[PDB]
Write a protein that holds these residues in place. Structure first.
Motif, PDB file in Angstrom:
ATOM      1  N   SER A 251       6.558   6.161 -43.154  1.00 38.92           N
ATOM      2  CA  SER A 251       5.406   5.257 -43.133  1.00 38.92           C
ATOM      3  C   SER A 251       4.204   5.806 -43.898  1.00 38.92           C
ATOM      4  O   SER A 251       3.602   5.111 -44.717  1.00 38.92           O
ATOM      5  N   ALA A 252       3.853   7.055 -43.641  1.00 43.97           N
ATOM      6  CA  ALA A 252       2.729   7.641 -44.344  1.00 43.97           C
ATOM      7  C   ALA A 252       3.053   7.692 -45.839  1.00 43.97           C
ATOM      8  O   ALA A 252       2.180   7.407 -46.665  1.00 43.97           O
TER       9      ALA A 252
ATOM     10  N   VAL B 279      -2.619   5.470 -43.436  1.00 43.32           N
ATOM     11  CA  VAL B 279      -2.095   5.582 -42.096  1.00 43.32           C
ATOM     12  C   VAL B 279      -0.604   5.331 -42.011  1.00 43.32           C
ATOM     13  O   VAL B 279      -0.090   4.426 -42.644  1.00 43.32           O
ATOM     14  N   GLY B 280       0.084   6.146 -41.225  1.00 37.08           N
ATOM     15  CA  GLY B 280       1.501   5.959 -41.022  1.00 37.08           C
ATOM     16  C   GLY B 280       1.542   5.528 -39.570  1.00 37.08           C
ATOM     17  O   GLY B 280       1.108   6.278 -38.699  1.00 37.08           O
TER      18      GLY B 280
ATOM     19  N   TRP C 110       7.749   8.560 -39.360  1.00 38.61           N
ATOM     20  CA  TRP C 110       6.382   9.030 -39.441  1.00 38.61           C
ATOM     21  C   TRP C 110       6.145   9.497 -40.872  1.00 38.61           C
ATOM     22  O   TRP C 110       5.103   9.208 -41.453  1.00 38.61           O
ATOM     23  N   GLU C 111       7.107  10.220 -41.443  1.00 43.36           N
ATOM     24  CA  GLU C 111       6.955  10.669 -42.822  1.00 43.36           C
ATOM     25  C   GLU C 111       7.127   9.466 -43.733  1.00 43.36           C
ATOM     26  O   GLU C 111       6.397   9.304 -44.703  1.00 43.36           O
TER      27      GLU C 111
END
Lengths: 170, 161
Positions: B108-109, B133-134, B105-106
């Motif tokens: 990808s964003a 966007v992640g 999540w971190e």
């Protein structure tokens, strides 16, 4: 009857039970009942939208930082298991305007910060009990240019109905 | 009038895909890598995908810092994108393979932003990107950076107007 407009009203009522229960958590617990001028829970169309907004007095994060305030951390953790109540997935957005517009063409602006605040709330929801797989995406939205309100800084938690999540995951 | 202005934007978005591939074939290095590039018109606007291959990942493994060529693709397409009012939505997609501290999540964003800053430094406008966007993970095919040039109704739904 129908089977497309019935799973479609069982849902509007599911998200409505969620909204009603979220206000019960807030109002009946006093740790969040004083934080209510920061929380707006309304029905949009992708599902349920929980906005956690800053006040001039009290921001949810420390200035120019992705570190949550003690009370923000309390809202994230207070709502997490009520969100586990239903199966719908979530979209977390971070809206930031802490830095000047022009830091934008630089290293760490409102862009990185907004994404970081979104993931920070995420880790917090997760620390509160949120089940794995609930979060669908993290969004970072830096504030646009203005010529020359602190709603501009908030975290939005969107509980997605089936449509929306299908559209986001096509 | 509706479809009238809507057809103007469609034709305009057409020039873009076309003007995009122009340089992908004309620039010997974007051409060497066109097989990481994918420009398709979607119902929301023009979508550009930068895919990973098994030897050529766009970011250093586990990192959000770009590889030399990722840096090239982005800064090359930037000048172009900038010639039109249309705004962008930048999405990062991680590959499953680490979960409590730093997660996909971190990651990808962060790749969404690292890309935006390569664009921003390649001359792209300031205020061009509407959001990052992640999407994390839901093989190198799901380790992609999706760049969406939004049409007016796609961008109006996102802004909530």
């Amino acid at each position: 009857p129908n089977i497309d407009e019935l799973k479609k009203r069982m849902e509007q009522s599911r998200l409505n039970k969620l909204r009603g229960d979220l206000d019960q958590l807030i109002e009946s617990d006093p740790k969040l009942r004083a934080l209510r001028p920061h929380l707006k829970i309304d029905l949009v169309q992708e599902g349920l939208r929980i906005q956690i907004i800053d006040s001039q007095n009290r921001p949810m994060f420390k200035t120019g930082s992705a570190e949550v305030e003690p009370y923000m951390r309390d809202i994230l953790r207070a709502i997490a298991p009520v969100l586990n109540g239903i199966p719908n997935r979530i979209s977390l957005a971070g809206h930031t305007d802490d830095f000047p517009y022009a830091n934008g063409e630089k290293g760490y602006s409102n862009w990185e910060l907004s994404a970081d605040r979104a993931n920070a709330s995420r880790r917090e929801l997760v620390a509160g009990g949120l089940d794995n797989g609930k979060v669908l995406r993290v969004v970072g939205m830096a504030a646009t240019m203005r010529l020359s309100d602190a709603i501009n800084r908030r975290i939005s938690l969107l509980v997605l109905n089936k449509q929306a999540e299908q559209a986001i995951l096509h």
